[PDB]
Amino acid sequence: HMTYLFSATVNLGGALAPIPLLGGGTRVVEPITGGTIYGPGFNATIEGGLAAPILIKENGTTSQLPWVYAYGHASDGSPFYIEEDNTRLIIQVGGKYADLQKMYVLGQPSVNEERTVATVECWSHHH
Ligand SMILES: C/C=C(C)/C=C/C=C(\C)c1cc(O)cc(=O)o1
C-alpha cells in the first residue's frame, strides 16, 4: 500500500524578498545550492534548482503552495530532475532508479526556522 523511498536534505541559499502578487499573495524565491537524497529507493546528489512557494491567505489562514524544481545526479551517475507541486513529487531519472517515473510519489517537506535547510520524506502510494 505505501513504501518509503527516500529522504532529502536540501541546502537553501539567500532567498529573495517576497514578491507581491495581484490579489494579495506573495511569491518567495529560494535558490537551492545543494543537498543529498538518501534511502532504499533513491540516492542522489542535488546540484541546483529553486523553490518558489506561493503564500496566499484564504479565510484568515495562510496556505503555502509549494513549487520546487531541482536537479542533480543519482548515485549511478544518471542526471535527474524533480518537480514538486502532502505534495506530489515527479522524479525523472534513467539508469538504476528509472522505475521512479512509474510511481506516484508524495513528500512531506519541512524547513528549519532560519530557512537554510529543507528536509522531506518521500514515499510511493500504490494508489
Ligand atoms: C526531492 C525533494 C526536494 C528536493 C524538495 C525540496 C523542497 C523545498 C526546497 C521546499 C521549500 C519550501 O519553502 C517549501 C517546500 O515545500 O519545499
Short mmCIF file of N, CA, C and O and ligand atoms in Angstrom, two decimals:
data_model
loop_
_atom_site.label_atom_id
_atom_site.label_comp_id
_atom_site.label_asym_id
_atom_site.label_seq_id
_atom_site.Cartn_x
_atom_site.Cartn_y
_atom_site.Cartn_z
N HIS A 1 0.76 -1.24 0.00
CA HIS A 1 0.00 0.00 0.00
C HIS A 1 0.80 1.30 0.00
O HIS A 1 0.37 2.28 -0.60
N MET A 2 1.92 1.33 0.72
CA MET A 2 2.75 2.53 0.76
C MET A 2 4.17 2.11 1.07
O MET A 2 4.40 1.28 1.95
N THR A 3 5.13 2.68 0.36
CA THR A 3 6.51 2.29 0.53
C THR A 3 7.41 3.50 0.68
O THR A 3 7.40 4.41 -0.15
N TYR A 4 8.21 3.48 1.74
CA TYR A 4 9.21 4.52 1.93
C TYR A 4 10.26 4.44 0.83
O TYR A 4 10.80 3.37 0.55
N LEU A 5 10.56 5.57 0.22
CA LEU A 5 11.53 5.64 -0.86
C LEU A 5 12.82 6.34 -0.48
O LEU A 5 13.91 5.78 -0.68
N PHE A 6 12.75 7.56 0.05
CA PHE A 6 13.96 8.31 0.36
C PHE A 6 13.57 9.53 1.17
O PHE A 6 12.40 9.93 1.23
N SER A 7 14.59 10.11 1.82
CA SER A 7 14.55 11.45 2.40
C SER A 7 15.50 12.35 1.62
O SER A 7 16.44 11.89 0.97
N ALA A 8 15.28 13.66 1.69
CA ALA A 8 16.19 14.60 1.07
C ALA A 8 16.55 15.68 2.08
O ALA A 8 15.71 16.10 2.88
N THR A 9 17.81 16.09 2.07
CA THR A 9 18.27 17.29 2.78
C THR A 9 18.68 18.30 1.73
O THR A 9 19.52 17.99 0.89
N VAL A 10 18.06 19.49 1.75
CA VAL A 10 18.25 20.47 0.69
C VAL A 10 18.77 21.76 1.32
O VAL A 10 18.13 22.33 2.20
N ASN A 11 19.92 22.21 0.85
CA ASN A 11 20.52 23.47 1.29
C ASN A 11 19.94 24.62 0.48
O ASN A 11 19.91 24.55 -0.76
N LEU A 12 19.48 25.66 1.18
CA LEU A 12 18.81 26.78 0.56
C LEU A 12 19.70 28.00 0.66
O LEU A 12 20.34 28.24 1.70
N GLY A 13 19.81 28.73 -0.44
CA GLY A 13 20.61 29.93 -0.49
C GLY A 13 19.79 31.12 -0.06
O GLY A 13 18.67 31.01 0.44
N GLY A 14 20.37 32.29 -0.30
CA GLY A 14 19.73 33.55 0.02
C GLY A 14 18.43 33.74 -0.73
O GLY A 14 18.41 33.99 -1.94
N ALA A 15 17.33 33.71 0.02
CA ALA A 15 16.03 33.90 -0.57
C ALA A 15 15.84 35.34 -1.02
O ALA A 15 16.43 36.26 -0.45
N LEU A 16 15.01 35.52 -2.02
CA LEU A 16 14.64 36.86 -2.44
C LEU A 16 13.52 37.33 -1.52
O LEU A 16 12.80 36.52 -0.93
N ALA A 17 13.42 38.65 -1.34
CA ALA A 17 12.30 39.23 -0.60
C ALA A 17 10.99 38.83 -1.27
O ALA A 17 10.96 38.57 -2.48
N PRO A 18 9.89 38.74 -0.51
CA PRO A 18 8.61 38.34 -1.12
C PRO A 18 8.19 39.30 -2.23
O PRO A 18 8.34 40.52 -2.12
N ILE A 19 7.69 38.71 -3.30
CA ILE A 19 7.15 39.42 -4.46
C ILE A 19 5.65 39.54 -4.26
O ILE A 19 4.95 38.52 -4.16
N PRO A 20 5.10 40.75 -4.27
CA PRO A 20 3.65 40.91 -4.06
C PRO A 20 2.91 40.53 -5.33
O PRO A 20 3.26 40.99 -6.42
N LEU A 21 1.93 39.65 -5.20
CA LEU A 21 1.15 39.22 -6.34
C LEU A 21 -0.20 39.89 -6.38
O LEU A 21 -0.79 40.16 -5.34
N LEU A 22 -0.72 40.08 -7.58
CA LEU A 22 -2.06 40.59 -7.71
C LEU A 22 -3.01 39.70 -6.92
O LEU A 22 -2.99 38.48 -7.08
N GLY A 23 -3.85 40.30 -6.11
CA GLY A 23 -4.80 39.59 -5.31
C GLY A 23 -4.38 39.43 -3.87
O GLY A 23 -5.20 39.07 -3.04
N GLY A 24 -3.09 39.63 -3.58
CA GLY A 24 -2.63 39.73 -2.20
C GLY A 24 -1.65 38.65 -1.79
O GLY A 24 -1.11 38.75 -0.68
N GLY A 25 -1.43 37.61 -2.59
CA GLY A 25 -0.44 36.58 -2.25
C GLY A 25 0.97 37.10 -2.39
O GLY A 25 1.21 38.22 -2.82
N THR A 26 1.95 36.27 -2.02
CA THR A 26 3.35 36.60 -2.23
C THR A 26 4.06 35.38 -2.80
O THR A 26 3.63 34.24 -2.57
N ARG A 27 5.04 35.63 -3.66
CA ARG A 27 5.91 34.57 -4.18
C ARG A 27 7.28 34.73 -3.54
O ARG A 27 7.86 35.81 -3.57
N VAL A 28 7.82 33.67 -2.94
CA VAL A 28 9.15 33.72 -2.30
C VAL A 28 10.07 32.77 -3.08
O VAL A 28 9.77 31.58 -3.18
N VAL A 29 11.16 33.30 -3.63
CA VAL A 29 12.10 32.52 -4.42
C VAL A 29 13.25 32.12 -3.50
O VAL A 29 13.94 33.00 -2.96
N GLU A 30 13.48 30.81 -3.38
CA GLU A 30 14.53 30.23 -2.53
C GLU A 30 15.43 29.38 -3.43
O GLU A 30 15.08 28.23 -3.76
N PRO A 31 16.58 29.90 -3.86
CA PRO A 31 17.52 29.08 -4.63
C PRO A 31 18.00 27.87 -3.85
O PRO A 31 18.17 27.93 -2.63
N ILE A 32 18.18 26.75 -4.54
CA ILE A 32 18.75 25.54 -3.95
C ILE A 32 20.22 25.47 -4.32
O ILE A 32 20.57 25.54 -5.50
N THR A 33 21.07 25.33 -3.29
CA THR A 33 22.51 25.33 -3.52
C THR A 33 23.13 23.93 -3.49
O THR A 33 24.27 23.77 -3.92
N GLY A 34 22.42 22.94 -2.99
CA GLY A 34 22.96 21.59 -2.97
C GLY A 34 22.09 20.74 -2.07
O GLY A 34 21.04 21.19 -1.61
N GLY A 35 22.54 19.53 -1.82
CA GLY A 35 21.81 18.67 -0.90
C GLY A 35 22.01 17.23 -1.31
O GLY A 35 22.74 16.92 -2.24
N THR A 36 21.36 16.36 -0.56
CA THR A 36 21.52 14.92 -0.75
C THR A 36 20.18 14.22 -0.61
O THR A 36 19.31 14.63 0.18
N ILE A 37 20.02 13.16 -1.38
CA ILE A 37 18.86 12.28 -1.35
C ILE A 37 19.37 10.90 -0.94
O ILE A 37 20.37 10.43 -1.50
N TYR A 38 18.71 10.27 0.02
CA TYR A 38 19.22 9.01 0.54
C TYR A 38 18.06 8.12 0.96
O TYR A 38 17.08 8.59 1.54
N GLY A 39 18.17 6.83 0.67
CA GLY A 39 17.13 5.92 1.08
C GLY A 39 17.16 4.65 0.29
O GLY A 39 18.03 4.44 -0.57
N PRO A 40 16.20 3.76 0.56
CA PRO A 40 16.18 2.49 -0.18
C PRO A 40 15.79 2.65 -1.63
O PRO A 40 16.15 1.79 -2.44
N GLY A 41 15.05 3.70 -1.98
CA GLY A 41 14.51 3.85 -3.31
C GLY A 41 15.17 4.86 -4.20
O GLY A 41 14.85 4.92 -5.39
N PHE A 42 16.07 5.67 -3.65
CA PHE A 42 16.72 6.70 -4.45
C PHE A 42 17.86 7.25 -3.61
O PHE A 42 17.71 7.45 -2.40
N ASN A 43 19.01 7.42 -4.25
CA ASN A 43 20.21 8.03 -3.66
C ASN A 43 20.78 8.97 -4.72
O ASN A 43 20.93 8.55 -5.87
N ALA A 44 21.09 10.21 -4.36
CA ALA A 44 21.49 11.18 -5.36
C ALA A 44 22.08 12.40 -4.68
O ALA A 44 21.94 12.60 -3.46
N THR A 45 22.77 13.19 -5.48
CA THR A 45 23.28 14.49 -5.06
C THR A 45 22.50 15.58 -5.77
O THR A 45 22.38 15.55 -7.00
N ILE A 46 21.93 16.52 -4.99
CA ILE A 46 21.25 17.69 -5.53
C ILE A 46 22.31 18.72 -5.88
O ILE A 46 23.16 19.06 -5.06
N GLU A 47 22.25 19.22 -7.11
CA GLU A 47 23.20 20.20 -7.59
C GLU A 47 22.65 21.62 -7.71
O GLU A 47 23.44 22.58 -7.70
N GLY A 48 21.34 21.78 -7.82
CA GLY A 48 20.82 23.12 -8.03
C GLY A 48 19.32 23.02 -8.17
O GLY A 48 18.74 21.94 -8.09
N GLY A 49 18.71 24.18 -8.39
CA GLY A 49 17.27 24.31 -8.55
C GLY A 49 16.77 25.50 -7.73
O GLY A 49 17.53 26.40 -7.35
N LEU A 50 15.47 25.51 -7.51
CA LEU A 50 14.86 26.57 -6.72
C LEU A 50 13.53 26.07 -6.19
O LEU A 50 12.87 25.25 -6.82
N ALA A 51 13.15 26.60 -5.03
CA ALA A 51 11.78 26.52 -4.55
C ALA A 51 11.14 27.87 -4.82
O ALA A 51 11.79 28.90 -4.65
N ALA A 52 9.86 27.87 -5.20
CA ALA A 52 9.17 29.14 -5.46
C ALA A 52 7.78 29.04 -4.88
O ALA A 52 6.77 29.18 -5.60
N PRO A 53 7.67 28.87 -3.55
CA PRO A 53 6.34 28.79 -2.95
C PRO A 53 5.56 30.08 -3.10
O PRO A 53 6.09 31.20 -3.17
N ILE A 54 4.25 29.90 -3.14
CA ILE A 54 3.30 31.00 -3.12
C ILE A 54 2.60 30.94 -1.77
O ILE A 54 2.11 29.88 -1.36
N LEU A 55 2.59 32.06 -1.08
CA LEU A 55 1.87 32.21 0.17
C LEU A 55 0.57 32.96 -0.10
O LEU A 55 0.60 34.08 -0.62
N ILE A 56 -0.58 32.38 0.25
CA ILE A 56 -1.87 33.01 -0.02
C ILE A 56 -2.75 32.87 1.21
O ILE A 56 -2.91 31.76 1.74
N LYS A 57 -3.36 33.97 1.64
CA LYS A 57 -4.29 33.94 2.76
C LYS A 57 -5.70 33.71 2.23
O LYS A 57 -6.14 34.43 1.32
N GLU A 58 -6.39 32.69 2.74
CA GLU A 58 -7.79 32.47 2.41
C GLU A 58 -8.54 32.14 3.69
O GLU A 58 -8.16 31.23 4.43
N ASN A 59 -9.60 32.90 3.95
CA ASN A 59 -10.41 32.77 5.15
C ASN A 59 -9.55 32.84 6.41
O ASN A 59 -9.70 32.04 7.33
N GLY A 60 -8.62 33.80 6.43
CA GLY A 60 -7.86 34.10 7.63
C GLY A 60 -6.69 33.20 7.92
O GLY A 60 -6.08 33.33 8.99
N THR A 61 -6.35 32.28 7.03
CA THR A 61 -5.26 31.35 7.27
C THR A 61 -4.35 31.31 6.05
O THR A 61 -4.83 31.19 4.92
N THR A 62 -3.05 31.42 6.28
CA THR A 62 -2.10 31.38 5.18
C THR A 62 -1.84 29.93 4.78
O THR A 62 -1.46 29.11 5.62
N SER A 63 -2.06 29.62 3.51
CA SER A 63 -1.69 28.34 2.93
C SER A 63 -0.44 28.59 2.09
O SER A 63 -0.32 29.63 1.44
N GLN A 64 0.48 27.64 2.11
CA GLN A 64 1.68 27.74 1.30
C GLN A 64 1.55 26.73 0.18
O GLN A 64 1.39 25.53 0.44
N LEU A 65 1.60 27.21 -1.06
CA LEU A 65 1.51 26.31 -2.20
C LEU A 65 2.92 26.06 -2.71
O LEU A 65 3.52 26.97 -3.30
N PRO A 66 3.48 24.88 -2.51
CA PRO A 66 4.87 24.68 -2.89
C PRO A 66 4.99 24.42 -4.38
O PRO A 66 4.12 23.81 -5.02
N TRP A 67 6.06 24.98 -4.93
CA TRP A 67 6.57 24.72 -6.26
C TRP A 67 8.07 24.57 -6.11
O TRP A 67 8.71 25.46 -5.53
N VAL A 68 8.60 23.46 -6.54
CA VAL A 68 10.02 23.16 -6.39
C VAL A 68 10.53 22.48 -7.64
O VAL A 68 9.87 21.59 -8.19
N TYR A 69 11.73 22.89 -8.08
CA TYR A 69 12.39 22.35 -9.27
C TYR A 69 13.84 22.10 -8.89
O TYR A 69 14.52 23.04 -8.48
N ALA A 70 14.29 20.85 -8.97
CA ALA A 70 15.65 20.51 -8.53
C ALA A 70 16.28 19.50 -9.47
O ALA A 70 15.58 18.73 -10.13
N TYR A 71 17.61 19.47 -9.51
CA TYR A 71 18.28 18.61 -10.45
C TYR A 71 19.59 18.22 -9.84
O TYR A 71 20.03 18.82 -8.88
N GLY A 72 20.15 17.15 -10.39
CA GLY A 72 21.42 16.62 -9.89
C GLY A 72 21.74 15.32 -10.59
O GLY A 72 21.30 15.09 -11.72
N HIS A 73 22.60 14.52 -9.94
CA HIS A 73 22.89 13.18 -10.42
C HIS A 73 22.66 12.16 -9.34
O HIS A 73 22.95 12.39 -8.17
N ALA A 74 22.11 11.03 -9.76
CA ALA A 74 21.90 9.88 -8.91
C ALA A 74 23.21 9.17 -8.68
O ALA A 74 24.20 9.44 -9.36
N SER A 75 23.19 8.24 -7.72
CA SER A 75 24.39 7.56 -7.26
C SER A 75 25.06 6.77 -8.36
O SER A 75 26.28 6.49 -8.25
N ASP A 76 24.30 6.35 -9.38
CA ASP A 76 24.85 5.67 -10.54
C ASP A 76 25.31 6.63 -11.62
O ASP A 76 25.78 6.16 -12.68
N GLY A 77 25.26 7.94 -11.37
CA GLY A 77 25.69 8.91 -12.35
C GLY A 77 24.59 9.50 -13.19
O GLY A 77 24.86 10.44 -13.94
N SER A 78 23.36 9.00 -13.08
CA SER A 78 22.32 9.40 -14.03
C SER A 78 21.79 10.78 -13.66
O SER A 78 21.48 11.00 -12.49
N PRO A 79 21.66 11.70 -14.60
CA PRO A 79 21.05 13.01 -14.28
C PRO A 79 19.60 12.84 -13.90
O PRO A 79 18.91 11.96 -14.40
N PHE A 80 19.13 13.69 -12.97
CA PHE A 80 17.72 13.64 -12.60
C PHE A 80 17.14 15.04 -12.52
O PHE A 80 17.86 16.04 -12.34
N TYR A 81 15.81 15.08 -12.57
CA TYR A 81 15.03 16.30 -12.46
C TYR A 81 13.81 15.97 -11.64
O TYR A 81 13.14 14.97 -11.90
N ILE A 82 13.54 16.78 -10.62
CA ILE A 82 12.43 16.57 -9.72
C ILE A 82 11.60 17.85 -9.74
O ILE A 82 12.16 18.96 -9.71
N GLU A 83 10.27 17.70 -9.79
CA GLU A 83 9.32 18.80 -9.77
C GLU A 83 8.32 18.46 -8.66
O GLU A 83 7.77 17.36 -8.66
N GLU A 84 8.13 19.38 -7.71
CA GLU A 84 7.21 19.23 -6.58
C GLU A 84 6.10 20.24 -6.75
O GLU A 84 6.36 21.36 -7.22
N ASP A 85 4.86 19.85 -6.42
CA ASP A 85 3.69 20.72 -6.57
C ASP A 85 2.57 20.33 -5.61
O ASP A 85 2.67 19.34 -4.88
N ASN A 86 0.60 16.84 2.31
CA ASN A 86 1.43 16.06 1.38
C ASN A 86 1.43 16.69 0.00
O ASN A 86 0.42 17.25 -0.45
N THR A 87 2.57 16.62 -0.68
CA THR A 87 2.69 17.14 -2.03
C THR A 87 3.21 16.03 -2.92
O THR A 87 3.86 15.09 -2.44
N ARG A 88 2.91 16.13 -4.21
CA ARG A 88 3.38 15.15 -5.16
C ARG A 88 4.73 15.56 -5.73
O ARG A 88 4.92 16.71 -6.14
N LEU A 89 5.64 14.60 -5.79
CA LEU A 89 6.94 14.77 -6.42
C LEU A 89 7.01 13.90 -7.67
O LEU A 89 6.80 12.68 -7.59
N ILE A 90 7.37 14.50 -8.79
CA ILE A 90 7.55 13.81 -10.06
C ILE A 90 9.06 13.70 -10.24
O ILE A 90 9.75 14.74 -10.25
N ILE A 91 9.58 12.48 -10.30
CA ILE A 91 11.02 12.21 -10.41
C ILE A 91 11.27 11.68 -11.82
O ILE A 91 10.64 10.70 -12.24
N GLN A 92 12.10 12.39 -12.57
CA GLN A 92 12.54 11.98 -13.89
C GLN A 92 14.04 11.64 -13.85
O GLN A 92 14.87 12.52 -13.61
N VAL A 93 14.35 10.36 -14.05
CA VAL A 93 15.72 9.84 -13.97
C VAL A 93 15.72 8.56 -14.78
O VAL A 93 14.71 7.87 -14.81
N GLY A 94 16.84 8.28 -15.45
CA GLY A 94 17.07 6.98 -16.08
C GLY A 94 17.93 6.09 -15.19
O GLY A 94 17.98 6.25 -13.97
N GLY A 95 18.57 5.10 -15.81
CA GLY A 95 19.52 4.32 -15.03
C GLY A 95 18.84 3.45 -13.98
O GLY A 95 17.69 2.98 -14.15
N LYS A 96 19.55 3.19 -12.88
CA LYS A 96 19.04 2.17 -11.99
C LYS A 96 17.78 2.59 -11.24
O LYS A 96 17.04 1.69 -10.80
N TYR A 97 17.53 3.90 -11.09
CA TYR A 97 16.34 4.38 -10.38
C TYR A 97 15.20 4.73 -11.34
O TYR A 97 14.24 5.39 -10.93
N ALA A 98 15.30 4.35 -12.61
CA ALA A 98 14.33 4.78 -13.61
C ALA A 98 12.90 4.43 -13.24
O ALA A 98 11.97 5.13 -13.68
N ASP A 99 12.69 3.37 -12.47
CA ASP A 99 11.32 2.99 -12.14
C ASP A 99 10.61 4.01 -11.26
O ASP A 99 9.39 3.94 -11.10
N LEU A 100 11.33 4.99 -10.69
CA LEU A 100 10.65 6.07 -10.00
C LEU A 100 9.67 6.82 -10.90
O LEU A 100 8.71 7.41 -10.40
N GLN A 101 9.91 6.85 -12.21
CA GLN A 101 8.99 7.51 -13.12
C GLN A 101 7.61 6.87 -13.14
O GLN A 101 6.64 7.52 -13.54
N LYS A 102 7.51 5.62 -12.73
CA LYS A 102 6.26 4.89 -12.81
C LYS A 102 5.47 5.03 -11.52
O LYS A 102 4.36 4.50 -11.44
N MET A 103 6.04 5.72 -10.53
CA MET A 103 5.48 5.77 -9.19
C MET A 103 4.79 7.10 -8.92
O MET A 103 5.19 8.15 -9.42
N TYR A 104 3.79 7.03 -8.04
CA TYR A 104 3.11 8.20 -7.50
C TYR A 104 3.78 8.53 -6.17
O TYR A 104 3.57 7.83 -5.17
N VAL A 105 4.61 9.56 -6.17
CA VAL A 105 5.50 9.85 -5.05
C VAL A 105 4.97 11.08 -4.31
O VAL A 105 4.66 12.10 -4.93
N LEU A 106 4.84 10.95 -2.99
CA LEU A 106 4.34 12.00 -2.13
C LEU A 106 5.45 12.40 -1.16
O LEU A 106 6.30 11.58 -0.79
N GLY A 107 5.47 13.67 -0.78
CA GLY A 107 6.53 14.19 0.06
C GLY A 107 5.98 15.10 1.13
O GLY A 107 4.98 15.79 0.93
N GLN A 108 6.64 15.07 2.28
CA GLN A 108 6.29 15.86 3.47
C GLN A 108 7.49 16.74 3.78
O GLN A 108 8.44 16.30 4.46
N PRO A 109 7.52 17.97 3.27
CA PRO A 109 8.70 18.82 3.48
C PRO A 109 8.55 19.72 4.70
O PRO A 109 7.46 20.16 5.07
N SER A 110 9.68 19.96 5.35
CA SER A 110 9.75 20.92 6.43
C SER A 110 11.00 21.76 6.23
O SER A 110 11.96 21.31 5.60
N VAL A 111 10.96 22.98 6.74
CA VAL A 111 12.07 23.92 6.64
C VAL A 111 12.42 24.40 8.04
O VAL A 111 11.53 24.72 8.84
N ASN A 112 13.71 24.44 8.33
CA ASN A 112 14.17 24.90 9.63
C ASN A 112 13.80 26.37 9.83
O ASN A 112 13.49 27.09 8.87
N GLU A 113 13.78 26.81 11.09
CA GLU A 113 13.30 28.16 11.39
C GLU A 113 14.01 29.19 10.51
O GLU A 113 13.36 30.04 9.89
N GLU A 114 15.34 29.10 10.43
CA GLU A 114 16.16 30.07 9.71
C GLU A 114 16.13 29.88 8.21
O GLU A 114 16.73 30.68 7.48
N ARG A 115 15.43 28.86 7.73
CA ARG A 115 15.15 28.67 6.32
C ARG A 115 16.44 28.49 5.52
O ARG A 115 16.60 28.99 4.41
N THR A 116 17.36 27.72 6.09
CA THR A 116 18.58 27.34 5.39
C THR A 116 18.58 25.88 4.95
O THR A 116 19.38 25.50 4.08
N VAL A 117 17.71 25.06 5.52
CA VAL A 117 17.69 23.64 5.20
C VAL A 117 16.23 23.22 5.11
O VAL A 117 15.43 23.54 6.00
N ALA A 118 15.86 22.57 4.02
CA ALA A 118 14.57 21.92 3.87
C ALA A 118 14.83 20.42 3.93
O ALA A 118 15.84 19.93 3.40
N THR A 119 13.94 19.68 4.60
CA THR A 119 14.01 18.22 4.62
C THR A 119 12.66 17.65 4.22
O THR A 119 11.61 18.21 4.55
N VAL A 120 12.68 16.54 3.50
CA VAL A 120 11.44 15.92 3.04
C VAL A 120 11.61 14.41 3.09
O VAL A 120 12.66 13.88 2.70
N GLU A 121 10.58 13.72 3.56
CA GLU A 121 10.49 12.27 3.50
C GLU A 121 9.47 11.89 2.43
O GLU A 121 8.35 12.39 2.44
N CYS A 122 9.87 11.00 1.52
CA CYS A 122 9.08 10.65 0.35
C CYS A 122 8.75 9.18 0.32
O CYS A 122 9.60 8.33 0.63
N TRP A 123 7.51 8.88 -0.05
CA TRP A 123 7.01 7.52 -0.13
C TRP A 123 6.12 7.39 -1.36
O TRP A 123 5.55 8.37 -1.85
N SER A 124 6.04 6.18 -1.89
CA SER A 124 5.18 5.90 -3.03
C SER A 124 3.86 5.37 -2.52
O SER A 124 3.81 4.59 -1.56
N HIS A 125 2.78 5.80 -3.15
CA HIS A 125 1.47 5.24 -2.88
C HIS A 125 1.19 4.27 -4.02
O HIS A 125 1.12 4.68 -5.18
N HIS A 126 0.98 3.01 -3.67
CA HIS A 126 0.46 2.02 -4.59
C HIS A 126 -1.02 2.26 -4.88
O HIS A 126 -1.81 1.32 -4.96
N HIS A 127 -1.40 3.53 -5.00
CA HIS A 127 -2.76 4.01 -5.27
C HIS A 127 -3.87 3.09 -4.80
O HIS A 127 -4.86 3.55 -4.24
C1 LIG B 1 13.32 15.77 -3.67
C2 LIG B 1 12.53 16.88 -2.97
C3 LIG B 1 13.04 18.08 -2.82
C4 LIG B 1 14.42 18.45 -3.36
C5 LIG B 1 12.16 19.10 -2.10
C6 LIG B 1 12.56 20.34 -1.88
C7 LIG B 1 11.64 21.32 -1.16
C8 LIG B 1 11.97 22.56 -0.78
C9 LIG B 1 13.35 23.17 -1.02
C10 LIG B 1 10.85 23.35 -0.08
C11 LIG B 1 10.91 24.71 0.21
C12 LIG B 1 9.75 25.36 0.61
O1 LIG B 1 9.80 26.70 1.04
C13 LIG B 1 8.55 24.64 0.72
C14 LIG B 1 8.53 23.31 0.32
O2 LIG B 1 7.53 22.68 0.26
O3 LIG B 1 9.69 22.70 0.00
#
